[PDB]
Amino acid sequence: SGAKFRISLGLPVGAVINCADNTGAKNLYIISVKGIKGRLNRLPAAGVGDMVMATVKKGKPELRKKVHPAVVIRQRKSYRRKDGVFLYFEDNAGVIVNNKGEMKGSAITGPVAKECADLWPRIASNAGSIA
Amino acid sequence: MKLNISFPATGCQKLIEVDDERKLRTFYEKRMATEVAADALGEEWKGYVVRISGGNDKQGFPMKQGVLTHGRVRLLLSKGHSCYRPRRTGERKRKSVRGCIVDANLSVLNLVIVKKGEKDIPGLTDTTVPRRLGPKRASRIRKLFNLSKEDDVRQYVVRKPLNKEGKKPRTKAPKIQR
Amino acid sequence: MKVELCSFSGYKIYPGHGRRYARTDGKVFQFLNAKCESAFLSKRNPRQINWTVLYRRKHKKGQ
Amino acid sequence: KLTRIAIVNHDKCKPKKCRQECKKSCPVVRMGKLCIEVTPQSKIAWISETLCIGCGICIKKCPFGALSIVNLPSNLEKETTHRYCANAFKLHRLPIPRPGEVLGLVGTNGIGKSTALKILAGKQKPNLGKYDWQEILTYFRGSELQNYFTKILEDDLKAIIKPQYVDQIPKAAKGTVGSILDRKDETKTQAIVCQQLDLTHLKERNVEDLSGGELQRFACAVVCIQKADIFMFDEPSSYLDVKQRLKAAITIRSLINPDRYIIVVEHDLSVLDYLSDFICCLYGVPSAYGVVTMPFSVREGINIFLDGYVPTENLRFRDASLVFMCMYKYPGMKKKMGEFELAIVAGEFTDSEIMVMLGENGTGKTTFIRMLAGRLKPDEGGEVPVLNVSYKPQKISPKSTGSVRQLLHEKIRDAYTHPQFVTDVMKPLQIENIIDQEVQTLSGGELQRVALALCLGKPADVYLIDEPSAYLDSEQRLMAARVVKRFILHAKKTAFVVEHDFIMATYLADRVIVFDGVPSKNTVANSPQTLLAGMNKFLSQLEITFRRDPNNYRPRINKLNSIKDVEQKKSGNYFFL
RNA sequence: GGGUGACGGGGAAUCAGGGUUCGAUUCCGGAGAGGGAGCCUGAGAAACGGCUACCACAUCCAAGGAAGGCAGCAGGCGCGCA
RNA sequence: AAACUGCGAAUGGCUCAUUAAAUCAGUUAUGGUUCCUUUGGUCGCCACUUGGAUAACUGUGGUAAUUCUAGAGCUAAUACAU
RNA sequence: UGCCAUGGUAAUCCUGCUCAGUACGAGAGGAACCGCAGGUUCAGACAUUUGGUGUAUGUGCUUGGCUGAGGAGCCAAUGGG
RNA sequence: CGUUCAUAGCGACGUCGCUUUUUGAUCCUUCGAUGUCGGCUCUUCCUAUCAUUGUGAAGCAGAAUUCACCAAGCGUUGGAU
RNA sequence: GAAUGGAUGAACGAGAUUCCCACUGUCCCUACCUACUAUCCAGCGAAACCACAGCCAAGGGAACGGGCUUGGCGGAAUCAG
RNA sequence: CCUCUGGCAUGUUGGAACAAUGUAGGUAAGGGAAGUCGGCAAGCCGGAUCCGUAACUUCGGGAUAAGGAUUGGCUCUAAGG
């Protein structure tokens, strides 16, 4: 019911956020952001809690050389919360996921941003620490 | 805070609920074993001195003196320590204690009344439960009754009658040791 | 509006200001300003920095 | 890995009237095989689920709807703990009762719940899908089940069952409440149990004179008195009031010794949560088969139940996850009996509205309801609204010999046909399956579904709803709640709901009327308050608080003087949203 | 330096005289208690049916925290010809 | 009964992962060391016997939850001291 | 201090919730209007906050040299940070 | 053809047109020189309408949909070679 | 395709390509700062180019007009771009 | 790069501003070649000591291959005639 609010998004298409679930993927090369109409010359960009088509660039060869949906979970670009606190995350990160929002992994290392957890319940359940 | 106040000179102690930050503001940001005046607490406790021996944190974790801060610290403990009973000869264990410093972050405060002022209170200074048993070592018997070595310790000894045994009360007494 | 303490300096941080840092170990730090944040990142021990609270506690200043 | 199970409903299957049938339409039998065996003679039809295709032809042909064919995973065939007959129910696994820990079974009815309770009691020997005690014990090794059964077999453990059906107890025992308790003494703890369950007033009265809630209190008190191990409790909360059902939970938790096994069965989830320390779910196709899950925590087990997804088995058993103008104005009416002084505060009654009634079993929700109807006459004042009204009662008996079809058309033909009613009431309350059965042979939940349908169908302005959640499954409860909502939204006819369940009350409530004061004394019926404020008053009167688990936002119950409780009382937010 | 379908030995199995092979396995010796490390007590331990970390597995939590080690004996799962 | 005190819990049991002059075996050294216990030797102005502390017991508790424990009363020792 | 002829001109589309697993449909599947919460692209602003810049050449720190040293400074096309 | 039914959607054999975002014809203009492909950047116009607004159609139950009308207001992207 | 040399090939190359790591304002998507200009003044002071000149739409015309026809219209003198 | 000896008056002018465009320098959140024909341009790298150094090889090389660590100030010690 409660919608997302925009947040400063510092993962343009080309970024390698590190995979932070137990799949076996190390990296996640972001090849496109989901739900972006866009403009001329503007790279699509995903903040925390965004859906994103990624490719795994290093990790298990089951995962390599194919596209996955994923969710950005942490991000180093500082976003503002409605309560006026800016917040940033030390690393960019994500998790491999399926179209309907379920994790294909099982346990999320490190914290998940609450912008993402509120939006993605199955990620939030596996997430040890939030924000 | 669920203040546990104890008047030691009687042998009676109460659990007093307290709210309103300004009521407790005398206690806050003070160390353990400091003697605070309880006049600001209430006009019932008019001119009362209370030592703050530091009870329990919320989340059940006792204050232990020395650690400072107003948060939890976890320490390696041993035989001869607060907050820890070792279950083996030279057992040693990690347990989380809490700050000496007093804060609203607390379930209980422990207070020991050092001096009562003018007023009295119903379940503390009125009630007078005795020392449960009297002296047992000879020297302490002599010191209680002022005897010296040439005065017979056997006769001037404490003795408790246990009534409602079933048949009749034994005029019972310990074994004087030393 | 829970006023928070700066993880480096010790100054209070009012609602509007400052910045929050969520390290991947899974513990978070507030910073009053960028000066403090930089110091924390360069690994400067605030007990060796004269303007921080921690320094003043250590060296028994005031009182 | 998938297999099939044939099921023949023995009440419906009458081989004489229909002829052979199945055989003639079955393509395996028309080939020339022993897929189905019937004849005009003999009772019940037999089907070989080995030879059966599962074409779904025989079910369409059979005239009564006697046959069913379902698909069950092939993993389960190893772990069958009971099957009574051929072409009948097939139970998989058993719950894992732990000594000195209250087991909480959760799951809808018709999924081998009763058979499990009988097995654990020790009435039914697990036939293990054979249709043996050393062989059964070897089957149950490496688990507390073999411990449990070994305990049963040499030390004769006493199986005692608080029953589901409470209305059948009055027509069996005789004498006063106090006399029966005195007869059944073993522990010699009447007084303490009576003070916990409030049977001070009730000791004098007869068993027939008691209401539903008082009968439950009586039955639980009796079970608490009896010195026995392995306590089976089957829906203790149903018929009870908020504070009564918590007390009943506390008593059952007090019965815990390390000797005794306890096995509660609750459908109010907050009450179950409070009761148990240990939970086991019961998923399957209703009437066809049932699987007892591995034992989870209290919290984890109920989350699994709400998701409809066992993560360990990886079997999504349920499809969907079950997560969370002014018509008239009464003035300040007062109705003094003589010694007792019932009172009302003035307020509004907006159309298309469900007014939830908060209070107690005794504060006279039922008496106010009867007064509003005209079924009770006024001592003072005078509630005489020129309005048609409907009345879903608490106690529901089937003393009208016939079919449910007959009941439906006799009461209300137009609603019974009307599609808007049918999508709203008949379908969601699976009345299409009850329809054919007799009114005599209903279950308790099925009777509650029919009651909901009968009173919704009868035209009115006001709709009184006493205990709709009583006896229904947690799923059915939530359906029944939706049905009432939508019916009223279409009709623009107000309703009033006596519920004692904080799940259902929060679901249904637009506005909420609260009662205050003890029963058989002065009742101060407040004006219709907003939901936010209304529940907080009711919780403050009964001294409870709740919280919400972030995954499903389900209302969990608190302990007295727990930090979370104390914080919530100081804030004034006794629960959330 | 690498390997070992390597714990050592007493011994076992074959055998004319020689040998060939085996010795996880009830006595003796060693080493180890999921993996690595550190230590308290104590005459004796770098103990694991003692603690402290990390890793790897996993359990309740009211999510703030808390506990864990069958290569003891039963027993389970799994692995498998066993 | 409890609780403090003392002793034991380093044996036994399991397994054979490691480990190839290592383990281990026979052989010898400790005139290069430790050793609870056992056994035998030694054991020349409070002493008509000193100090205070604590547990069980009593009673307020805190925590959702552990073989968690805190504060207040007492009271011994071959414990701890002089 | 104002009027206004004439010119110009601007807003856009989407998602989620709800209606609703409802209409419709044998079932599989599966809508819509009113509401509510937000977002895209575009436009016009602005600097409380976060960020960027920084020769206030503000204030430390430091390299090589130069005022005999201390101190106070300067030079190295903005010495570097 | 479209189960049936020429025309919902199509449409053979024939036939009538429009267009200058194809390519040819042509050689009027420029050889005392009109800077010769693409891309980037920026504005504007057209409609022969992909999307969006309002609608008529169906071989439109719903969902998805093609067919047609008013219509050029607003859009119509990021990359690999 | 074989001293019109074929096949090879360490070392070397301001030679021609391709990918990866690092690094970066190349880009998303631009911003701020410095010096010298441009800017204004004193003084000094050129050139190329020039039929006449210098607002448009359409028409016709050597088939893309500043001038012609028919319409729209037209307000001194100048500055930086 | 800084200084003395010696030598100059900033390279055919000055003043006042600190706009846009430029020329020459810098810096940039998050991303990191997505830019472009193309990493063009800039940036990374860099000195020394101590380790450590592959393919291939004409056995010479490759080789500062690659990849690491250290580096200031001060007070001493030892070693070299």
Ligand SMILES: Nc1ncnc2c1ncn2[C@@H]1O[C@H](COP(=O)(O)OP(=O)(O)O)[C@@H](O)[C@H]1O
């Ligand atoms: N003794 C019996 N003989 C034959 N069929 C039975 C018997 N008891 C129950 N059944 C059938 O089994 C079905 C489910 O019964 P049961 O398993 O007891 O209920 P639940 O599934 O709620 O535990 C019923 O529909 C009934 O037809």
Ligand SMILES: Nc1ncnc2c1ncn2[C@@H]1O[C@H](COP(=O)(O)OP(=O)(O)O)[C@@H](O)[C@H]1O
């Ligand atoms: N018509 C009546 N005549 C006499 N007493 C009545 C009548 N109706 C109700 N009562 C009494 O009122 C009491 C409460 O009524 P009831 O509907 O049972 O309320 P509740 O279900 O809350 O107990 C009962 O004990 C009953 O004896």
Ligand code: SF4
């Ligand atoms: S279902 Fe199995 S049994 Fe019933 S008809 Fe088809 S085949 Fe014969």
Ligand code: SF4
């Ligand atoms: S199944 Fe239906 S049809 Fe076949 S016999 Fe039993 S009843 Fe008659």
Ligand SMILES: [Mg+2]
């Ligand atoms: Mg582009």
Ligand SMILES: [Mg+2]
């Ligand atoms: Mg090996």
Ligand SMILES: [Mg+2]
């Ligand atoms: Mg051995």
Ligand SMILES: [Mg+2]
């Ligand atoms: Mg060992």
Ligand SMILES: [Mg+2]
């Ligand atoms: Mg193991």
Ligand SMILES: [Mg+2]
């Ligand atoms: Mg060890």
Ligand SMILES: [Mg+2]
């Ligand atoms: Mg063990």
Ligand SMILES: [Mg+2]
């Ligand atoms: Mg100086």
Ligand SMILES: [Mg+2]
């Ligand atoms: Mg035809």
Ligand SMILES: [Mg+2]
């Ligand atoms: Mg030109």
Ligand SMILES: [Mg+2]
């Ligand atoms: Mg058109």
Ligand SMILES: [Mg+2]
């Ligand atoms: Mg040739």
